[PDB]
């Protein structure tokens, strides 16, 4: 028991639990397409709670970009993958969007980011490749990543 929240010296922390139960200082990230369809997978809850869908289209983000919304004091990262859900995202393009997250996080002082198992749903990706890539991109950052796995 320690009052300071220490990470265990890791990039991706695997925890089973609901992702929406995360703190206000801890930001959410997930992947979606350019068409932005939340009506599939975990994306549904983010649309409902954070009201991201229109705002994302309002900002106009396309493949290789990230759309972020400040909501409840935390950030919400929408990694824009490819045009639609029927399209398989590439890891390189996903990497592009991952880079944008780290750049934003460090800039604002966001040292806490949680995400679900991205690259494991309609995205059709292999987590072994996805996770390792995230683990490389964020390898040298003060960003505490925790994946909520259901
Ligand atoms: N509220 C939740 N909290 C924690 N975990 C959850 C929650 N809801 C679902 N999960 C679990 O974590 C994972 C949710 O992430 P995914 O949607 O499966 O993976 P992701 O990369 O985010 O999917 C995005 C892809 O599908 C479309 O939304 C979009 O087109 C994009 O390409 C799933 O395995 C699910 O079981």
From Swiss-Prot:
Documented activity regulation: Subject to competitive inhibition by the product ADP-ribose.
One family name in Pfam for this protein: Macro
Result, substituting residue 81 to A: Reduced catalytic activity. No effect on affinity towards substrate
GO cellular component, one term: nucleolus
Protein name per UniProt: ADP-ribose glycohydrolase OARD1
Catalysed reactions, semicolon-separated: 2''-O-acetyl-ADP-D-ribose + H2O = ADP-D-ribose + acetate + H(+); 5-O-(ADP-D-ribosyl)-L-glutamyl-[protein] + H2O = L-glutamyl-[protein] + ADP-D-ribose + H(+); alpha-NAD(+) + H2O = ADP-D-ribose + nicotinamide + H(+)
GO molecular function, one term: ADP-ribosyl-[dinitrogen reductase] hydrolase activity
């Amino acid at each position: 028991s320690s009052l300071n929240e220490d990470p265990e010296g890791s990039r991706i922390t695997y925890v089973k639990g609901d992702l929406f139960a995360c703190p206000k200082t801890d930001s959410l990230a997930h992947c979606i397409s350019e068409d932005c369809r939340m009506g599939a997978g975990i994306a549904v809850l983010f649309k409902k709670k954070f009201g991201g869908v229109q705002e994302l289209l309002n900002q106009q983000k396309k493949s290789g970009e990230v759309a972020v919304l400040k909501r409840d004091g935390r950030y919400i990262y929408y990694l824009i993958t490819k045009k639609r859900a029927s399209h398989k995202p590439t890891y390189e393009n996903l990497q592009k969007s991952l880079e944008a997250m780290k750049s934003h996080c460090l800039k604002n002082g966001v040292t806490d980011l949680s995400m679900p198992r991205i690259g494991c749903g309609l995205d059709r990706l292999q987590w072994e490749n996805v996770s390792a890539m995230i683990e490389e991109v964020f390898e040298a950052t003060d960003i505490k990543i925790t994946v909520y796995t259901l």
